[PDB]
Design a protein that fits this description.
The structure is a homotetramer. The first copy, chain A, contains 17 helices and eight strands. The first copy, chain A, has about 375 residues and is an alpha+beta fold. The first copy, chain A, has three domains: about 100 residues; about 140 residues, Helix Hairpins; about 120 residues, Jelly Rolls (Sandwich). Chains in contact: A-B, A-C, A-D, B-C, B-D, C-D. Chains A and B meet through α8, α9 and α10 of A and α9 and α12 of B. It is classed as transport protein. Keywords: Ion channel, cyclic nucleotide, allostery, vision, olfaction, transport protein.
Chain lengths: ~375, ~375, ~375, ~375
């Protein structure tokens, strides 16, 4: 990234120089130039033909020749040529930050446009400098006034050519300026559109479903809740096939990331706080994420229970016989199903979702195999299972 | 949604204030301001730094200070700052309505552009206010005339700078205004294009088929009818894999929606009018939607029949031996195949599609299993089967 | 389609009327109006509130009232309102022709823009009509000159407001005109882009392959020929999974299309000229399309042959022992492999592709099963097999 | 391609002629025309109605008629008509080079626009030529000044109509010019956007993964390295299912390309330098590309080894017992696993990835089957296996 920071400095220096150069026609400054070349010399150190290019730009010219003994204007070009290296700078910049395509283009266009306007105004002056001797800020300002007004397509008509020469130049400018403006629009369009495309991809599935529903002419009562369903899922990203998605990752780091995912749900549950990491790993691999909606009878009392439900998110009602006696308002970090699973029994209580619930589920098969191995952590939750 | 309605009110108030503020330079109104702040105070109630921000905007300032004892212009800024909260308002708005991306952007640009034009005109005046004392509506109007003409890229050239100061300001304005216009185009492009993309997705499949047909150089006689085939299917949405599509839905509500789909074809058929809902559910799950074209020999007399055809949509000809005697012009809500299926027989009559027909089909296997269970509804249609 | 032709007529009539109406302010014509309403009356026949709308437009007004006894200008509006029905006309038009989205939009914008310019110019006149009595063509022309120049963003600055009233109107116009122009661009962008998207889809696969090749850094010698390979395939459409593609078609018409495909390769081959259609159908279903490249040793003499090759397109060299004696320059409509397949033998000759070759292949299994059934067409080619 | 080069020449000639023609109104040149037609005559040789068209353009007209005996202006049209053939030229051009869609459009628009401006200026002159006799360069220049200023939407307002006639023409021009400019933008937008789409496709997968990670709220420590992982893969193209990708290629050339891929990794390894090509082919088909990350314990000493690892790219540490004694710093072109695989043993040493490593892997099964066949190349590496 530091290498990129170096690029930024150099870039700025080049830009400044390209503005100072063309002005030649009409102490500290000298010291500034020393700095410029000095920086360029450091660039050479940072680094065939490219060497030659950099070398040339870094050659302390006019000053040197001044101390030895329009031409300085001509010499100014030596620092301009270097600009071509931007093609590699950009690559490094993208590598550094990785932004949305077009953003960088926008920056470049702003840069180029700026230079164009400046040089064009100078050219205008040149033509009219032949109508005088020297000029001041007022003239330069006027040149820009005309220049910009023309480039921007506005055209106040305040200033116009008198000779064919001037007319010709004007025509040249009009063509170029128009093109520039068009390309500006180009970026804006491409950038903005691409942003929309990204969002469209996200909604893709839900949209298809909605379309279907519309074809079936289903009432809003449901369709709205359907959309919401997908929206929430999208927010969580749980709808993604985590497994298959991760399956393209180098198994080494893949597992490390998987461990990070194990970290995501591991801390809340005291069982896992007091579990070993081989267990945690094994189990995390096993655990499946299930979504329940408000009111869902997750467990039905009397029915054979074959899975542990670890409540990541949401509120749950553990109800006895009467389906009213909330035995437990079961919340994030709690866990249920253990009574029936450890006892190899039917659910001795009913379990209702209060809210929408995110639960990690552990089938009896996995539960038994895992805690067969981890019999000390079979002994663990079995402890609590007594009540 | 009410929370969003509150946002709308606040938004409007802010906008109004931002127009009244900059005008400061050249009773009821006071009461209006009371209302404004009052509303903002309610916003505080609706709700750290954001508190401070709202607080500031809601501070009844100039009036207070007037009763205590250019500056009022300065104080007006206190209500402007708050505008930043739009970033959250927008989120809520989208959540509320969920419109096509870009539409909201368009609105925002209209809003911002409006303010820009207003403030810019004021700035113009300021520069030329230094050329006078006070001004009236005519001057304000003229300012807008110039401002808009410039921003819109038109440029009549009626009004122009005289001093460099003015020229500079003008250049600034030209740059900004041009950019604004460009972004306006941006939205229009992105919005319109996205609309086309949606439609393209719909035709995607048919288009591929058409392309194939064109490669094979098939005559219009067919290709047109092919397109129509797909068009109709699209209209109905029947081409969608309803099952797989629905398979990503929380089984609870999924089933409820499935029930809504059961509702869609359940009422017409008297068998199902007089069926129980366990049957209906079971059967609805079983029923498959089949499309027949005009003239199709759905049944052939003499051939083993192994399915019930419930006519959702279209006209059908039940023909005896001679293939002319329309035993029954069978229409929406009618059903056929029951004779052979209940009798375990061959079709004792031929069945032709009059029109295009949407039929829900029940295989003999499902039919028998279902009505084995629902033997009272086996007894039911079997009643009618006598004729 | 005739119904659509009727729409076209009506549309045109409406347009004309909307141009004649606003002109009111400054014999045959009367008869023309009779025609207009007459046409609208027929439209009523072609057809609640829509009835009322049409009715109103078809009411022969000013003339009637003239014979009974500015106001006529006012009455002209009665034919304008009807324009709203375009929303349904467009649907019918698309159904009729089915063109690329955006094309229709372009037409609509041209239509609307035209009307806007006209009405705007009239408004301009109105404002300045208050500065005079009556005007002629010259004034109308001038109005358009200003109007268009403004709308098109050009702005010559030749004509400008003098009163605030005029300035206000101008500002209104500038805003509207600018917006119009922007929307024009919108269509152009969306249309053109969509065209590119279509082509991109076509090249999609080949492009992916090319990308791979570029990553592998393979020489042009191959990559070019690879591209060509895909290009040719694309041209033919043979790369499409015809089967799976067709598998979404109503089996009835699907088969009919399949028959059309059977027609495509059936005529050339005398075997099939003199075959029955049950065979042709059966066989066509069986035949598989295979592509060979120049030089390919399709058959190798001595090797067990288990397939018939029916040459759709290209040139083939049947070579004996020496691989030089072209036993047969085998061309489109010819067929080979029959000797070995009928004789249950090894290829007694070698077969080379001269050119790229499109061949329909018939495995020995299918060949035998088919011509087991069609033993008379087993006897057929077996006849020729003698040599 | 030469045929295309011929097109280029002809195209240029046509263009030149279309500029010279309209100028008619106000020696060597004659010889130039001879050349023009001559070239067109050659075109006829390069080649019904198209013959007639070319013929006409190639007819040496004005000169002929001059030697026989405004009208010449009229005759100039004979070379213009031919331009229509561009529709076929373009096809050939694309076939020749195959560039990004839109690029060619851009060229065409530049071409057409140029001609429009020229002809329009002439028309302007014509109108004002009726106000004089003859004109010179200055007038022509002025015409262009006005023309371009108008077309480009700038509009200085320096020149304007005086008669209605002129006003009308102007209006016509304004409309056309505006449209042209719009279409210019169209291309720019479509081209630029399509470029972005290509890149988006490339990042598609990684982006999806990143999105997931963001939803899971994983730290940068990993996400950055994840992106890098994909980036590198993309750079290499190794993530592509080479097999399946290639599976759509004509097996003949497909294999040849496969051989090119065999060439890609074949040379480094002395085993394969001194192997036969049947082996190389067989083996290359077998070899699988595997990626290891820095630090990866590729082999663990003591564990059963069942695969040969041929190091395409990267650095590897062969470590004995102590996991420090780098037995071999194993680099590109080296190979490991052979000791255990030839000895049917456990890894007698541990192997760590120094860097990221690209390795082609050969399972023991394939290894044994291959070198069972190629027992002389089983004897080969087995030689070295001694140490």
């Amino acid at each position: 990234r530091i290498r990129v920071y170096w690029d930024i400095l150099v870039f700025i220096c080049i830009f400044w120089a390209s503005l100072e150069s063309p002005l030649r026609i009409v102490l500290l400054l000298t010291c500034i130039y020393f700095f410029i070349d000095f920086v360029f010399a450091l660039d050479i150190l940072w680094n065939g033909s490219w060497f030659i290019i950099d070398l040339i730009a870094a050659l302390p010219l006019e000053y040197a020749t001044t101390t030895i003994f329009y031409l300085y204007l001509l010499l100014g070009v030596t620092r301009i040529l270097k600009v071509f290296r931007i093609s590699d700078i950009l690559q490094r910049i993208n590598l550094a930050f990785q932004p949305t395509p077009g953003i960088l283009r926008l920056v470049l266009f702003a840069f180029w446009a700026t230079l164009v306007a400046h040089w064009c105004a100078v050219g205008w002056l040149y033509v009219d400098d032949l109508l005088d001797y020297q000029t001041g800020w007022s003239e330069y300002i006027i040149a820009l006034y005309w220049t910009v007004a023309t480039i921007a397509t506005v055209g106040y008509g305040d200033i116009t050519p008198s000779t064919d020469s001037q007319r010709i130049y004007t025509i040249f400018v009009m063509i170029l300026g128009a093109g520039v403006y068009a390309t500006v629009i180009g970026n804006i369009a491409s950038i903005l559109g691409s942003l929309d495309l990204a969002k469209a991809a996200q909604r893709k599935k839900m949209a298809q479903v909605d379309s279907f529903l519309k074809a079936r002419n289903i009432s809003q009562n449901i369709r709205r809740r359907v959309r919401d369903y997908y929206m929430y899922i999208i927010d969580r990203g749980w709808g993604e096939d985590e497994n298959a998605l991760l399956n393209d990752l180098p198994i080494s780091l893949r597992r490390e990331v998987k461990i990070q995912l194990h970290r995501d749900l591991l801390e809340k549950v005291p069982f896992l706080k007091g579990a070993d990491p081989a267990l945690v790993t094994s189990l995390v691999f096993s655990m499946k994420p299930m979504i329940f909606l408000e009111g869902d009878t997750i467990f039905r009392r009397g029915e054979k229970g074959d899975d542990l439900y670890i409540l990541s998110e949401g509120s749950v009602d553990i109800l006895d016989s009467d389906e009213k006696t909330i035995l437990l308002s079961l919340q994030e970090g709690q866990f249920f199903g253990e009574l029936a699973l450890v006892m190899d029994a039917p659910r001795s209580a009913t379990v209702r979702a209060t809210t929408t619930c995110e639960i990690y589920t552990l089938s009896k098969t996995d539960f038994d195999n895992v805690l067969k191995r981890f019999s000390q952590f079979r002994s663990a939750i079995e402890e609590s299972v007594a009540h």
